[model samples]
Target: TTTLKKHYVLEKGDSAFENLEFCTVTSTTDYSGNSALSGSLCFRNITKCVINLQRIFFQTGSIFITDCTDSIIFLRSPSDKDFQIRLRDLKNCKILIEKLSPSIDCKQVVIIENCHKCIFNASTRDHLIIQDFSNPFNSAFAFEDFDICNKDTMQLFRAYL
Candidate 1:
């Protein structure tokens, strides 16, 4: 897989792997907030795994995930901090984002591309975006309980009314 190839090359060059990690969470791996660093966390090309990222705080803008299958991921962010999740080329997966407090509105977004047979449970203050979302036959992709509050929509509607 590409993850294996990257890991092999990363070992040879210390500077190239700085502030970035490529992880292969094989099976039923539970992750905590403190486990992640201030750098980028990339999960790629894994299958049949249960990955949980609880209350993780990413200094960066987003988390990158690609080429995953048959996995369950739980992502939680802090009440005040906003985070973005980017996914691509995944199948038969479930992603759950923790609902934040009602009083705290943080702008968060989830970006999806070419993910099939996957369900996302998320609530965002901004919106969710998709790109090149192609699905195969008899397969499906959906977002469950996904909430997006656009501020301009309310203003525009109020002006019309």
Candidate 2:
């Protein structure tokens, strides 16, 4: 039996309007020593892509996390779209969502799991400060990881804190 090798190559192209463009290259030659299995090529270019991997293995609503040590936070309108989470400090946890399109309706919600101590903060919007800080060990802690859910038709940013 012989093993097959998968290879992909991309070339840069020049355009008057665009500085960098991707060009795909396919294999034109065949190998005599080893055999290659047939496979399909797929390509896509988009601004947003959402995948539901859990939908393939389990039923709907079956992919829930039951852990309660997490925290959930919601963002108001006019939030950034390119936000990232940093796991260095739970108390200083930061989410940097970048603002992309001004005309498009954008919103965000965060769901955290197994987080002991954390703080959430966001940029100023409409002359208002949007931030949330909670200590799971404190008695006034109202944020729970398991009870966090988003109802609005918005994107979610998830990570460990």
Candidate 3:
């Protein structure tokens, strides 16, 4: 099994390896070819980001998010065999999709300061844990099913229609 290395940056001036707040996305193929895309995304202070057509979806937008922990997060749509997402830290993050998986798994979530909107199609499931220290629902959030965990692992947010 041979291997290759590719460092991706958001812009011409943004080198992925040189920055801490960088999203290193990888997508490769082949049993007879090489290693699939894997990354070490250590983000610091960036303004915005967009992740598409990749196996990983980190902060889609804004730089206010901080202290990202290790988590197995899935794409809003779906990929191949990547199951479960673990978000360690996020701030003022945004997604374009109208509906999101209400069953979010993260160690902690930061200020989703409403720079964007990501809706959640919910369900009735317990064991919901949230470690939120900011406002519930930022600028233009449109939650669908509206069946989410009433309380977070830390506090209680009266989120509703």
Candidate 4:
């Protein structure tokens, strides 16, 4: 009956000491040529994580662009039905109204993003119809219009088109 022993060689700065927070290794195999001893090491005490959103914009061109992103618009009044629009280059993201009356006295909330160089104008008709527009011949109108209304969560890599 004989006992077996195994050993490993750690390169300079390779050994995992008590205070080490993170580390990276080239291979998992130990110096003994034993594959079973191969494994990875990770630090569980990572202190922080961060996420960022990319630039995005609305589509421009037509007022009836229902195919736009987040195109669903709801009226503030509970009695009123939801309205969908197809317009492009909407400057607002989300609109909320505290009062739901059919009149113009209702409260409203609107969200806008990436509007550093964009202008927006909106109009309503018959207390039920709403239309919006943006400025600048560049796709600024198109990007702001669609991005705002659609509320796209994904990051947009390019600013053009």
Better of 3 and 4 by lDDT: 3
Which one wins on TM-score?
1
Q: All candidates' lDDT scores? A: 0.48, 0.24, 0.28, 0.23
Q: Which residue pairs in model 1 clash with each other?
A: none
Q: Compose the digit string of candidate 2's lDDT tens values, residues 1-161.
A: 21112222211121011111121112222331232222112222211111111101111111121222222223222223423221211222222222223545443333344334433333422222223232334321132223122311123323322
**Structural similarity to truth (TM-score) of each candidate:** 0.52, 0.21, 0.28, 0.18
Instruction: Kindly list the per-residue Cα lDDT of model 1 for residues 7-68, writing each as its tens digit.
Output: 12211111111221232222112332332334445666666544444434434445677777
True-vs-predicted CA distance for residue 113, candidate 1, Å: 0.9
lDDT of 1 at 46: 60
- The predicted structure with the larger TM-score, 2 or 3, is 3
Poorly placed runs, candidate 1 (over 4 Å)? 1-38, 78-82, 99-103, 122-140, 144-161
User: Which regions of candidate 4 deviate over 4 angstroms?
Assistant: 1-72, 77-99, 102-104, 115-121, 125-161
Model 3 gets an lDDT of 0.28
Query: Model 2 compared with the native: what TM-score?
Result: 0.21
Flag clash pairs in model 2. 70-145, 81-98, 82-98, 83-96, 83-97
lDDT measured at residue 60 in model 2 versus the true structure, 0 to 100:
13
RMSD, candidate 4, Å: 23.7
> Model 3: what TM-score?
0.28
